[PDB]
Amino acid sequence: MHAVSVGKGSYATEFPEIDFGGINDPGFRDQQGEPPATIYRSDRVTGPMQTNSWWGSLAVDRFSMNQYPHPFSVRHRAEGLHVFYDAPHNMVVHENREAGTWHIHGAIGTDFTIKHSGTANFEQAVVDDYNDWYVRGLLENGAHQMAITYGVGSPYIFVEYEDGSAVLDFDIAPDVWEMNGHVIGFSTHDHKHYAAFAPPGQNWSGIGSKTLTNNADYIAIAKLPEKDGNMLAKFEQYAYSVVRDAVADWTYDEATGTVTTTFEVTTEAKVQGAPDGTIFALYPHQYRHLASSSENQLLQNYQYEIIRGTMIGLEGKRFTTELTYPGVLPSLPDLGDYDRERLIGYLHDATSDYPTGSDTYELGKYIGKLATLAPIADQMGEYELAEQFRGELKDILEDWLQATNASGQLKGKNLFYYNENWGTILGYHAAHSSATRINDHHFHYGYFVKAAAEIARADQEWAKSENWGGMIDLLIRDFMADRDDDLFPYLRMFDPYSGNSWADGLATFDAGNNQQSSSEAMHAWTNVILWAEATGNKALRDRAIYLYTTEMSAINEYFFDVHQEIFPEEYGPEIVTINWGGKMDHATWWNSGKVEKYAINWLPFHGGSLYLGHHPDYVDRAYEELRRDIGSTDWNLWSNLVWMYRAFTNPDDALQQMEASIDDYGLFDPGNEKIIERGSTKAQTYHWIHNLAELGRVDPTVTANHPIYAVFNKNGNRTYIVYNFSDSPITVQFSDGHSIQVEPHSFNIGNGD
């Protein structure tokens, strides 16, 4: 009737009568709602609706907000599609010294508007189709229709007309520098270079005026890299091949660690003989990893400058990238030179901790904290305390994973609900617009998966599908479903082409979609790898490995700029805190200080965090910049996160800072995150830093033929760590020739007591 049973748990199918707990705060109350009733999609788009996309504002707004199908920005309006390109004169880097914020951004301008001869009063723009990274937006006014196909990594906009023909409208007359009749090369008054293409014999008119017209029912627009007729001729070749399908298919080679992704389009010919293929514009995280076999397809001098650096052109039907999955762990092992009694004391101290809210995010942080403590307790021989932590995790998850109370009625809080309209699992209490905007499901549900993965590491029975595993796998499907999932869209959070997750479900911003905590995305992927390994689910594990590895490639480019090629020279910070489709900010979604604008992309620290240490010059450079700005090691907030980060390259320094201040305050205090961030503990901090002191640096040059491992290197001496989730012993082969044997349900070394 009102809930669906899933193993021992359930989800609500009717919106619950929310228990507000006597809280009258309007913000809190408004959070306990649902996503928008109205979805702007045609009747060609059925089933669970895609969210968390670069193009989402087209689905949520009557028209759209500003979008970034790089190299373009575009926006839908009643009058047609505005097209823009941020040239260097449009780009700015601004600093607000007192706020401690920086902003790299362009403009919301219009180079020209793509229009329909029959109307400039479209009623709405709807999603008419989409694939892994393109969208087809349909401007509708009865018989008059204009379908616009566009995407990230597409230097083409394809335009299909019903009951009318093409118009390009400009505020200032453009320079048409090449007139081939049906094909034109033109520049805006401010020297931005474009081209337009119509079928042979359909010639452009209005050359020299503010309005270019064509009788065709099909045109394409290209952004040209240069004012270059040879480039124009190359763009002609693919200007009539409209992208209909686009898939990012991947494989994980467990033996080598290689994650291979092939990006393939299928096009439809708009003139006789049009090739099946396109010109792709690749982002840095793609071309820096281009497969050998795709190199011949590069159009070497075809570059575009965008917010994310330089895009490069590549021609054909497909291209491939190759990445290396580095492994993850369920926890750091027991390899530190800590005082064991001191660590045991901190473990017991952590029993004072409690969640600082009732919503999925604050409860999430708390269960992540307990799940992080439990293996450390096992290591210290405190098995009863470890069991206390896991029992608390079980109590919390067995509550939240049930939608009904003892009487069989729907609960008013601590439950999950399936919104059928969009097709998404929502948790109440909600926060950060997790329900009202479908935000952050990876960030929040990642913590639930962490808790489940830690339970599963000790208790396989609990994790079985007919027990509590079914509900955990439901939460995972919400945020990273495979294809053809009856309840959820494909890989909700992830944008396979941009290479990162997008946190906002709706994308109703003029900067496109955004992601702030890339580390909470990586945490979600890590926990799915662990959960799936523990529960013997290879297909799920491998999908999470693909996500972890691809997301890592985008983080190192766009959040860290480890290669020092992307951020403008005049940008002061050594991190971008929030990445948007159209801009980059050193700023947070809440009013914060200096440390948080770095550390929100580090936290939480867990056994999947070692990707943060692959680039030690970056770790040094970022730390030194933060230290310069603070002016000392007196961190304004979250000191322990800074010490843990510093330990990636200088554990002696991290240790001395930790010794000086870790015991400044006593037990858990929600009002005071100066020393310990509220999702962290003294026990975790002390265990992490001492482990890194003994282990040395992350060594990403060594891979393994199983997925749950790490390799460290201290002055040339390697330490190899494997956790074995199997009932059987395993042998692990490393890429440097090292080979180890691991007993069931154990680390190879540092199991502790």
Ligand X SMILES: OC[C@H]1O[C@@H](O[C@@H]2[C@@H](O)[C@H](O)O[C@H](CO)[C@H]2O)[C@H](O)[C@@H](O)[C@@H]1O
Ligand Y SMILES: OC[C@H]1O[C@@H](O[C@@H]2[C@@H](O)[C@H](O[C@@H]3[C@@H](O)[C@H](O)O[C@H](CO)[C@H]3O)O[C@H](CO)[C@H]2O)[C@H](O)[C@@H](O)[C@@H]1O
Ligand Z SMILES: OC[C@H]1O[C@@H](O[C@@H]2[C@@H](O)[C@H](O[C@@H]3[C@@H](O)[C@@H](O)O[C@H](CO)[C@H]3O)O[C@H](CO)[C@H]2O)[C@H](O)[C@@H](O)[C@@H]1O
Contact residues for ligand Z, defined by CB under 6 A: 361, 365, 432, 440, 443-444, 516-517, 520, 589-590, 600, 603, 673, 679
Distance CA 241, CA 731 (A): 51
Residue 237 interacting partner from ligand Y, ligand Z, ligand X, none (CB closer than 5 to 8 Å by kind): none
**Site map (CB under 6 A) of ligand X, residues 450-489, x = contact:** ----------------------------------------
Interaction between residue 95 and ligand X (CB under 6 A):
no
List, as one string, the DSSP characters of 705-723: SSSBEEEEEETTEEEEEEE
589 binds ligand Y (CB under 6 A): yes
Binding of ligand X at residue 178 (CB under 6 A)? Answer: no
Cα→Cα distances 721→329, 379, 531, 686, 697, Å: 8, 15, 19, 19, 13
Question: Which of 426, 446, 451 minimizes the C-alpha distance to 525?
Answer: 446
Contact call for residue 437 and ligand Y (CB under 6 A): yes
The length of the chain in residues reads 753
If one asks whether residue 383 binds ligand X (CB under 6 A), the answer comes out as: no
> How far apart are alpha carbons 521 and 513 in whole angstroms?
15
61 binds ligand Y (CB under 6 A): no
As to burial, measured by CB atoms within 10 angstroms (0-12 exposed, 13-18 middle, 19+ buried), residue 151 is: buried
Q: Where are the beta strands (DSSP E) in 198-340?
A: 211-214, 218-223, 241-253, 258-269, 278-282, 298-306, 309-316, 318-324
**Identity of the residue, 410 or 493, whose beta carbon is nearer to ligand Z in the bound complex:** 493
Q: Determine, following the binding rule CB under 6 A, whether residue 589 of this chain makes contact with ligand X.
A: yes
Which residue bears the tokens 């298919």? 249
Q: Does 125 bind ligand Y (CB under 6 A)?
A: no
- The C-alpha atoms of residue 495 and residue 485 are separated, in whole angstroms, by 17
Position 508 contacts ligand X (CB under 6 A): no
Per CB under 6 A, 312 contacts ligand X:
no
Q: How far is the CB of 544 from ligand X (least distance, A)?
A: 28
Shortest spacing between CB 516 and ligand Y, in angstroms: 5
Q: Which two tokens stand for residue 455?
A: 């339970």
Could you say whether residue 495 binds ligand Y (CB under 6 A)?
Answer: no
Nearer to ligand X, 123 or 510 (CB): 510
Shortest reach from residue 49's CB to ligand Y, in Å:
18
Q: In whole angstroms, what is the distance from residue 548 CA to residue 480 CA?
A: 12
> Nearest to residue 596, comparing CAs of 649, 641, 650?
641
Q: Which of 42-50, 114-122, 264-272, 581-589 is the region at the interface with ligand X (rule: CB under 6 A)?
A: 581-589
Residue 354 beta carbon to ligand Y: minimum distance, rounded to whole angstroms: 22
Task: Give the shortest CB-587-to-ligand X separation in angstroms.
Answer: 4
Residues 438-457 that bind ligand Y (CB under 6 A): 439-440
- Under the binding rule (CB under 6 A), the answer on residue 650 touching ligand X is no
Q: Does 510 bind ligand X (CB under 6 A)?
A: yes
Looking at the Cβ atoms of 392 and 673, the one nearer to ligand Z is 673
Nearer to ligand X, 45 or 578 (CB): 578
Out of ligand Y, ligand X, ligand Z, none, which partner does residue 437 contact, by CB within 5 to 8 A per kind?
Answer: ligand Y
What one-character-per-residue DSSP string does 39-81 give? --B-TT--SSPP-S-TTTHHHHSSS---B--TT-EEEEETTEE
> 461: left (phi > 0), else alpha (psi -120 to 50), else beta?
alpha
State the binding partner of 673 from ligand Y, ligand Z, ligand X, none, CB within 5 to 8 A by kind: ligand Z
What torsion do the CA atoms of 378, 380, 383, 387 make, to the nearest 10 degrees?
A: -60
Contact 691, 332 (CB under 8 A): yes
Q: Minimum Å distance from CB 26 to ligand Z? A: 15
Asked if 597 touches ligand Y (CB under 6 A), the answer is no
Task: For the beta carbon of residue 238, count every other beta carbon within 10 angstroms.
Answer: 25
Tokens of 117: 């001869």
Contacted entry of ligand Z, ligand X, ligand Y, none for residue 15, CB cut-off 5 to 8 Å set by kind: none
Tell me which of 145, 516, 518, 685 binds ligand Y, using CB under 6 A: 516
Residue 576 touching ligand X (CB under 6 A)? no
Q: Residue 460's CB: how many other CB atoms inside 10 A?
A: 17
| Cα(403)–Cα(490) distance, integer angstroms | 25
**Residue numbers of the site for ligand Y (CB under 6 A)?**
432-433, 437, 439-440, 503-504, 514, 516, 589
**Residue numbers of the site for ligand X (CB under 6 A)?**
509-511, 578, 585, 587-589
